[PDB]
Amino acid sequence: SWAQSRDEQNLLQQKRIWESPLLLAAKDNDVQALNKLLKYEDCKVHQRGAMGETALHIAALYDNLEAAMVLMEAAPELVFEPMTSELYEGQTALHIAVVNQNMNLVRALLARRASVSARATGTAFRRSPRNLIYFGEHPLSFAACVNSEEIVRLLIEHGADIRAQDSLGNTVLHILILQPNKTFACQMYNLLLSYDRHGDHLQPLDLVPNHQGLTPFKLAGVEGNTVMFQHLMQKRKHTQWTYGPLTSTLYDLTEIDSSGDEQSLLELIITTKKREARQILDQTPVKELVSLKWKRYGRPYFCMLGAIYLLYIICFTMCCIYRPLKPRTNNRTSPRDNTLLQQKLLQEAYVTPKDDIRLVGELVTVIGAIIILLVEVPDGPFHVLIITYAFMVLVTMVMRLISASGEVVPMSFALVLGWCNVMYFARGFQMLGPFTIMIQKMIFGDLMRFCWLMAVVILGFASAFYIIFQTEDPEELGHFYDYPMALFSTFELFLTIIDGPANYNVDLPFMYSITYAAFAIIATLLMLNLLIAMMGDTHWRVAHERDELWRAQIVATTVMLERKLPRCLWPRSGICGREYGLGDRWFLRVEDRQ
Amino acid sequence: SWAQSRDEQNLLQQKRIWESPLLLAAKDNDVQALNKLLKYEDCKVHQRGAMGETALHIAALYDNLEAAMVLMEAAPELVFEPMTSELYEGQTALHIAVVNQNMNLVRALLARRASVSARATGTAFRRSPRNLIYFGEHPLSFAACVNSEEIVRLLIEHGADIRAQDSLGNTVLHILILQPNKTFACQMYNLLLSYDRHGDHLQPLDLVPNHQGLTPFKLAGVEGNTVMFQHLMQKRKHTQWTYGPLTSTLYDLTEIDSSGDEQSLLELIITTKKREARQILDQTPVKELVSLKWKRYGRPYFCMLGAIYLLYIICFTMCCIYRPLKPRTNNRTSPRDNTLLQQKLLQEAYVTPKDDIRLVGELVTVIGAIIILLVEVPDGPFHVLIITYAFMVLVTMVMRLISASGEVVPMSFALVLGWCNVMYFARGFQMLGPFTIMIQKMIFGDLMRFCWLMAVVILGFASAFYIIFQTEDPEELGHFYDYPMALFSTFELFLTIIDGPANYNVDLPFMYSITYAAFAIIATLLMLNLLIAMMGDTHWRVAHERDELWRAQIVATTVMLERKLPRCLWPRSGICGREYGLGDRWFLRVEDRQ
Numbered sequence A, B: 001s002w003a004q005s006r007d008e009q010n011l012l013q014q015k016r017i018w019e020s021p022l023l024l025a026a027k028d029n030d031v032q033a034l035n036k037l038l039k040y041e042d043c044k045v046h047q048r049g050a051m052g053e054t055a056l057h058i059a060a061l062y063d064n065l066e067a068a069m070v071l072m073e074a075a076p077e078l079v080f081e082p083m084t085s086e087l088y089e090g091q092t093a094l095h096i097a098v099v100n101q102n103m104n105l106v107r108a109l110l111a112r113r114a115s116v117s118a119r120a121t122g123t124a125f126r127r128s129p130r131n132l133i134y135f136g137e138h139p140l141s142f143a144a145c146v147n148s149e150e151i152v153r154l155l156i157e158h159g160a161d162i163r164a165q166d167s168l169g170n171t172v173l174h175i176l177i178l179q180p181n182k183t184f185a186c187q188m189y190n191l192l193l194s195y196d197r198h199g200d201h202l203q204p205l206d207l208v209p210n211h212q213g214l215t216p217f218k219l220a221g222v223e224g225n226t227v228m229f230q231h232l233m234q235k236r237k238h239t240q241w242t243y244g245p246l247t248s249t250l251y252d253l254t255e256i257d258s259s260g261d262e263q264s265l266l267e268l269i270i271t272t273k274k275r276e277a278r279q280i281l282d283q284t285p286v287k288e289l290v291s292l293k294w295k296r297y298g299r300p301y302f303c304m305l306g307a308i309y310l311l312y313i314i315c316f317t318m319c320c321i322y323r324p325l326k327p328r329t330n331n332r333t334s335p336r337d338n339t340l341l342q343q344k345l346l347q348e349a350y351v352t353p354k355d356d357i358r359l360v361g362e363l364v365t366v367i368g369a370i371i372i373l374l375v376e377v378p379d380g381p382f383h384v385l386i387i388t389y390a391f392m393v394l395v396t397m398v399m400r401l402i403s404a405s406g407e408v409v410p411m412s413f414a415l416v417l418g419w420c421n422v423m424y425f426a427r428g429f430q431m432l433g434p435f436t437i438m439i440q441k442m443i444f445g446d447l448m449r450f451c452w453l454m455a456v457v458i459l460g461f462a463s464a465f466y467i468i469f470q471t472e473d474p475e476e477l478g479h480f481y482d483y484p485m486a487l488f489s490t491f492e493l494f495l496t497i498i499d500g501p502a503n504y505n506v507d508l509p510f511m512y513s514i515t516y517a518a519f520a521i522i523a524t525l526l527m528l529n530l531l532i533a534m535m536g537d538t539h540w541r542v543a544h545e546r547d548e549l550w551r552a553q554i555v556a557t558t559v560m561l562e563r564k565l566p567r568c569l570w571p572r573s574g575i576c577g578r579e580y581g582l583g584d585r586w587f588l589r590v591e592d593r594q
């Protein structure tokens, strides 16, 4: 929709050029006709195009130097004209000569005092998936992103503010981080810091945030720019001594580690969707900072919560084992009625000393399910499972108070969710950590992507198996006696967890042997070993990147564990530079051998 | 703890430099202030730093030649001063100029007669995981390890004993083996043997042991230094003739093979924790020595003990098959009482001729279990299993004497441990050898690393399955009738070795179909095929390094088999050089084609 609208405008531009003799003589290098056209009376010099363009934009756009000069002595006021469309709003001819790097034509427009502070506020210039370039809004931003060091030196001299911000708030240093050629942005970043030699009317230029509060150093980490991260990090390290093949380097940790309640660089890499951003975790101030947080104050407090959680689930288990049950009051309805016990009423539930021991163990599992809904809910997948466990304990709390039949259904969800959250505390162990990443990527990327092909095969054969045995007696082969049991039996024959139905004392239907032989080939052989082969490649991919997926679990745990525990038992990392003559900062010393 | 203490001392050094005008003028190249400071009265020349350092240490540490010379004519007695801390104790300025390779400043301190036998006995110089360098203690050791051939020639002339030993006992040749740049240590090893041209007041320098009794040749094998092993081996080989493309080389085998009761090089590579040390087993005197020990005297005596052990386990088996049993004296307690035989008392056990044949077969399995506890216990995993077997035979010996019920529990351990020690004698066969390395690395590296995630899933669903069927009659579906049977049934449904519970003649509970369908997906599909895919990569890794893992089993067997058999049936390997005019040594001839 948006692309089809944009394509009809770029074809409409080439029509309006082709119709106008003025614009066609500018597109071509036709200085002959531009003489003869401009000597006519009134000439339609200020005629508009499809993009809002003028004649002097066209000569700048097609790199026609000789046609662009003749239009400037004819009409000198075309230099001050922006494009007036919606898709190129504000773009002047000084932007177009800067992008095309027409070095001779930039000096011409600066001699005609073209404004170097004109903002290209269109929609082909926004940072968006619709646009292939994001060059900013000012001519200094366009020249820096095309790697034109001569034009950047040229129009800073003519007075381009280097501290200018576009709509997103990005300065010229934020935009250089977002460019795809990362090597040339490192040479260009240094050239723009050789300037800013002014009065420094705020904090210096590499410390100015955009509208999301990111300085250029944090934006190089959030976006995943590892080349511009290491280049910007060398302003922060500080070599103490060099003793042969040894170097004691002292890193800064001011924007990397959490100062107060602001979001630090470790909190922003975890809370972003770029897979490239998790390459910053392997960098030389950040790799040593996570190991200090984890080995000292993270792994003690994570194996302490993990052992308080085991004693909570064993206490919840034994008060589901010893739940109150009484013999059945009624008589059996049908011969298919197997239930012979029944749960007690609330009055008769607690009338013995062993019921008072259970009442203590039941108050603990209620209090612990309220504390989960005060730590977690007023704020990944184990967020949802610890909340869902906490509801199921309070759903079966209500059913004990108002005496309601069917407490086994909230308890059975609470047993298998309460026990399978012990898998959360497996990221404290390096050899057990990414096992839960394999269980995640097999469920939400292999099973939830191939169950749609199994539910087709199960519904096809369970309906065939049901009507084959629909005339038969279920007291011999009762696998398919009604339709929900034929679906459950066919799901079990698929996974080969119950044996195939056979009697050998009666004559089975003729279509049974043919249908079950076709079933056991497409279901048990072929489509069950597709899934085992799909999950075998998911295992291989995760176990290959095994140690970098564990370190992203350690960062996310330490960030979680610090913002919820009180500050008095979480010391700040590093050495404080007050009483060593280094400032107010917090340094991390790294000694290395080369 | 130790690292946080070390970091606060290296920041305290940079503060005390920055405070003192004397030390700050030495850190910088400030010969101006050092003139004006030293001309003041008393100057605090002997002022101490945070590391125990003086002013002349600082100028040596920051490579300031012009500042270090002015401090020597001012105070000439600063040359004889060690650092006085705990982390740099004994280090002089002559060590610091040697490490930094300040060639002009070393000749200055030797002109000021700095002692070349001063020991850097700190804690930043010990061989330790805390330190990134191990350079020794003397200036000759520091210069040799930084590959400075000019300083080593310089201070041997000024009288550095080349035969000096640090606290670990290492000479200058032991320290060169421990260095990470192995190629430059080979050039440096030869230069220090061009010296030792003295009276040779003990055995020569490449034969001097440290405090663990290792010469440099054995230390290059224990540490895994294969480059310095082949370089030191060429002093031992001896070419006899060269007949075209043929070479009869004669190797020495004095330190490689076991002379007496001392530990040889093959006994030290097996008994070390370096994985690098097992690369020495593929070297040209050592690869041919293991094949001679195994093909001649190892494989006969290992297939002879392996056939005496089969006749021992068949004899132990048939006296467990024919154990004394009598009909049950009591009557059945409950309908769940299935036992209808009972073991005899000791009086009535041996009263027939077939009991006298068994008594012979039972005395053999008692004697053979005592001999195991006289060969093995007065001294890897099959150490423990042959000892555990030997206890279980003597536990069930006691229970036969004092008549005690329950001999089936010591026997059942003794049957499966006695038979699975036949897998020990599978390293005598090259195609069966590393199969037991795959069984080891799957148990103690895959199962004991993923059973913690299965015991979470089994405890979650066995508790759910138990309370679903807790109101139901167990005479139809009795898989989960009490809680230890619900755990054993859920472990069996996990591994898919019993069929899923179904009746089809009664109505099962509603939560059963939902819980078992969720169980059969996460347990039988997903987490059972994780483990099969994890063990599939353990197979692939071991079968790749298949032949070098078999040769480390052959070395460890031959070492074991030689120190336990008497010497009269184990001939020494090689040809003795007495009656061929070669010494007292034992040579191994290798003929090769190039």
Ligand SMILES: CCCCCCCC/C=C/CCCCCCCC(=O)O[C@@H](COC(=O)CCCCCCCCCCCCCCC)COP(=O)([O-])OCC[N+](C)(C)C
Binding pocket: A307, A308, A310, A311, A312, A314, A315, A318, A319, A322, A354, A357, A358, A360, A361, A362, A364
């Ligand atoms: C770190 C990892 C730990 C490792 C494992 C360590 C522990 C693992 C194992 C642990 C125990 C093993 C159980 C054995 C069964 C006998 C017990 C018993 O006497 O039960 C009695 C009732 O008991 C109840 O009713 C239980 C209900 C409440 C339990 C908790 C109360 C205190 C909670 C406050 C603090 C909670 C924690 C605080 C939370 C932070 C009666 O039972 P019985 O009739 O005698 O049973 C025989 C049945 N049979 C005859 C058929 C055979």
Ligand SMILES: CCCCCCCC/C=C/CCCCCCCC(=O)O[C@@H](COC(=O)CCCCCCCCCCCCCCC)COP(=O)([O-])OCC[N+](C)(C)C
Binding pocket: B307, B308, B310, B311, B312, B314, B315, B318, B319, B322, B354, B357, B358, B360, B361, B362, B364
């Ligand atoms: C290298 C690999 C070898 C390959 C395989 C070769 C061997 C493999 C096979 C071997 C034999 C197979 C057995 C067949 C059964 C008949 C035997 C018999 O007569 O038993 C009798 C009792 O016998 C006993 O009580 C046995 C107890 C002691 C056995 C050892 C005694 C001498 C040990 C000293 C030296 C030990 C060695 C020294 C140690 C260094 C009675 O038995 P039965 O009542 O007639 O049984 C019929 C039962 N049925 C009727 C229900 C069916």
Ligand SMILES: CCCCCCCC/C=C\CCCCCCCC(=O)O[C@@H](COC(=O)CCCCCCCCCCCCCCC)COP(=O)([O-])OCC[N+](C)(C)C
Binding pocket: A299, A300, A302, A303, A304, A306, A307, A308, A310, A311, A422, A423, A424, A425, A426, A428, A429, A430, A431, A432, B452, B453, B456
């Ligand atoms: C699917 C679920 C699977 C996992 C289930 C987990 C659930 C239970 C969770 C955790 C249960 C308890 C921990 C288990 C292991 C014991 C200690 C240990 O070695 O762990 C860690 C050290 O931990 C330490 O720091 C030891 C020093 C004591 C500090 C406090 C420890 C708390 C122990 C109880 C005091 C509590 C006080 C309240 C009283 C109850 C070692 O971790 P690592 O170095 O990173 O290992 C990586 C290397 N590896 C993998 C190769 C080995």
Ligand SMILES: CCCCCCCC/C=C\CCCCCCCC(=O)O[C@@H](COC(=O)CCCCCCCCCCCCCCC)COP(=O)([O-])OCC[N+](C)(C)C
Binding pocket: A380, A381, A384, A385, A388, A413, A440, A441, A442, A443, A444, A445, A446, A448, A538, B517, B518, B521, B522
């Ligand atoms: C009421 C009782 C239960 C209540 C709580 C339980 C509710 C569920 C718990 C947690 C769910 C909430 C977290 C979202 C999923 C996490 C994964 C994710 O981050 O993104 C995922 C999108 O996610 C989805 O696909 C949406 C989920 C659809 C089904 C949800 C309900 C079905 C229950 C499910 C029953 C499990 C079936 C087994 C047994 C029946 C994308 O996948 P990925 O992981 O990011 O990458 C893998 C892709 N790769 C392979 C290409 C690399």
Ligand SMILES: CCCCCCCC/C=C\CCCCCCCC(=O)O[C@@H](COC(=O)CCCCCCCCCCCCCCC)COP(=O)([O-])OCC[N+](C)(C)C
Binding pocket: A451, A452, A455, A456, A459, A481, A482, A483, A484, A487
């Ligand atoms: C991925 C998830 C899918 C899982 C698959 C299964 C999910 C199903 C989940 C639950 C279904 C069971 C609910 C329990 C209540 C019982 C009512 C009932 O259904 O059966 C009733 C019958 O009526 C029917 O036959 C209804 C089924 C019609 C065909 C199924 C199409 C729906 C699937 C389309 C989805 C397509 C999307 C998938 C492909 C893209 C009762 O059966 P009866 O007792 O035998 O009565 C017969 C009367 N007679 C005796 C006269 C003969």
Ligand SMILES: CCCCCCCC/C=C\CCCCCCCC(=O)O[C@@H](COC(=O)CCCCCCCCCCCCCCC)COP(=O)([O-])OCC[N+](C)(C)C
Binding pocket: A507, A508, A509, A510, A511, A514, A517, A518
């Ligand atoms: C097969 C697996 C693949 C499936 C593919 C689909 C192809 C489908 C092909 C054919 C299906 C067409 C069925 C024909 C109708 C017959 C009518 C009838 O009732 O039977 C009669 C006998 O009839 C016979 O016994 C015929 C014997 C051959 C049947 C087809 C064998 C398929 C060979 C495949 C070779 C390999 C090909 C594949 C290679 C990979 C009556 O017998 P009855 O004893 O009285 O039983 C009635 C009992 N009842 C009354 C209770 C109901």
Ligand SMILES: CCCCCCCC/C=C\CCCCCCCC(=O)O[C@@H](COC(=O)CCCCCCCCCCCCCCC)COP(=O)([O-])OCC[N+](C)(C)C
Binding pocket: B299, B300, B302, B303, B304, B306, B307, B308, B310, B311, B422, B423, B424, B425, B426, B428, B429, B430, B431, B432
């Ligand atoms: C899980 C356990 C599995 C294994 C079961 C082990 C338990 C039984 C163990 C061993 C039982 C007996 C040996 C079995 C094989 C026979 C000989 C042989 O070929 O082996 C070896 C030669 O062995 C020789 O040296 C033969 C020359 C006679 C010397 C003494 C042999 C002892 C035989 C009885 C006299 C004793 C007197 C006491 C009275 C009984 C060949 O070894 P290889 O060349 O290195 O193999 C590599 C090639 N391959 C793998 C491709 C083949």
Ligand SMILES: CCCCCCCC/C=C\CCCCCCCC(=O)O[C@@H](COC(=O)CCCCCCCCCCCCCCC)COP(=O)([O-])OCC[N+](C)(C)C
Binding pocket: B380, B381, B384, B385, B388, B440, B441, B442, B443, B444, B445, B446, B448, B538
């Ligand atoms: C009472 C009856 C039995 C009595 C004796 C039996 C006791 C046990 C016998 C021998 C044990 C003594 C040797 C230790 C294990 C050898 C492995 C080793 O050297 O290093 C291991 C550390 O070792 C461990 O992990 C410690 C073992 C913990 C559990 C021990 C008892 C459990 C029984 C066990 C029950 C087995 C369960 C199956 C069926 C039940 C490291 O593993 P690795 O091999 O060096 O390399 C593989 C890792 N890789 C893959 C990353 C490369």
Ligand SMILES: CCCCCCCC/C=C\CCCCCCCC(=O)O[C@@H](COC(=O)CCCCCCCCCCCCCCC)COP(=O)([O-])OCC[N+](C)(C)C
Binding pocket: A310, A314, A317, A318, A321, A322, A422, B451, B452, B455, B456, B459, B481, B482, B483, B484, B487
């Ligand atoms: C990897 C190794 C772990 C293996 C997993 C399995 C290990 C288990 C091994 C052995 C257990 C069985 C021992 C035999 C003696 C019987 C006593 C008994 O347990 O049941 C008794 C009940 O009491 C209970 O319910 C206790 C169980 C509570 C929860 C389990 C916590 C232990 C696991 C925590 C460790 C977490 C570490 C793992 C995760 C990090 C008797 O049962 P009953 O007859 O039905 O009585 C009910 C009375 N009623 C009739 C009134 C209702």
Ligand SMILES: CCCCCCCC/C=C\CCCCCCCC(=O)O[C@@H](COC(=O)CCCCCCCCCCCCCCC)COP(=O)([O-])OCC[N+](C)(C)C
Binding pocket: A339, A406, A409, A451, B507, B508, B509, B510, B511, B514, B517, B518
């Ligand atoms: C399912 C597998 C995954 C599990 C995930 C967890 C999700 C859990 C979702 C739901 C669980 C919540 C249960 C609701 C409570 C009902 C109360 C009741 O007792 O039943 C009533 C009927 O009620 C019905 O039959 C409802 C119809 C089916 C609903 C659930 C189908 C799940 C569809 C999933 C589609 C694919 C989704 C997944 C795709 C991969 C009474 O019936 P009854 O005959 O009288 O029986 C009582 C007999 N008793 C008295 C002996 C006890």
Ligand SMILES: CC(C)CCC[C@@H](C)[C@H]1CC[C@H]2[C@@H]3CC=C4C[C@@H](OC(=O)CCC(=O)O)CC[C@]4(C)[C@H]3CC[C@]12C
Binding pocket: A305, A308, A309, A312, A364, A367, A368, A371, A372, A375, A376, A380, A381, A382, A383, A384, A386, A424, A560
């Ligand atoms: C009455 C008393 C004795 C009961 C004790 C209660 C504890 C067993 C509970 C109370 C608070 C719980 C914690 C509350 C919140 C969290 C955060 C939660 O983190 C996540 O969900 C992050 C997972 C992810 O995003 O991947 C993990 C469980 C944990 C530590 C809980 C572990 C179990 C705790 C310690």
Ligand SMILES: CC(C)CCC[C@@H](C)[C@H]1CC[C@H]2[C@@H]3CC=C4C[C@@H](OC(=O)CCC(=O)O)CC[C@]4(C)[C@H]3CC[C@]12C
Binding pocket: B305, B308, B309, B312, B364, B365, B367, B368, B371, B372, B375, B376, B380, B381, B382, B383, B384, B386, B424, B560
């Ligand atoms: C009464 C008589 C006829 C019985 C004969 C007894 C033999 C069957 C026993 C006695 C001594 C036993 C040996 C004693 C000790 C050892 C060393 C033991 O070596 C290890 O445990 C090393 C394994 C490892 O470290 O990996 C292997 C079994 C073996 C050869 C035993 C094999 C079986 C032997 C020969």
Ligand SMILES: CC(C)CCC[C@@H](C)[C@H]1CC[C@H]2[C@@H]3CC=C4C[C@@H](OC(=O)CCC(=O)O)CC[C@]4(C)[C@H]3CC[C@]12C
Binding pocket: B380, B381, B382, B412, B413, B416, B417, B420, B423, B427, B436, B437, B439, B440, B443, B553
């Ligand atoms: C009656 C029941 C309860 C007894 C339980 C039996 C297990 C405790 C035993 C039987 C089989 C044994 C295994 C048989 C073979 C091996 C391979 C073995 O591998 C090696 O040592 C190879 C080393 C090398 O050659 O370099 C290590 C012991 C292990 C895992 C054993 C460990 C203990 C096991 C599992």
Ligand SMILES: [Ca+2]
Binding pocket: A498, A499, B498, B499
């Ligand atoms: Ca079966």
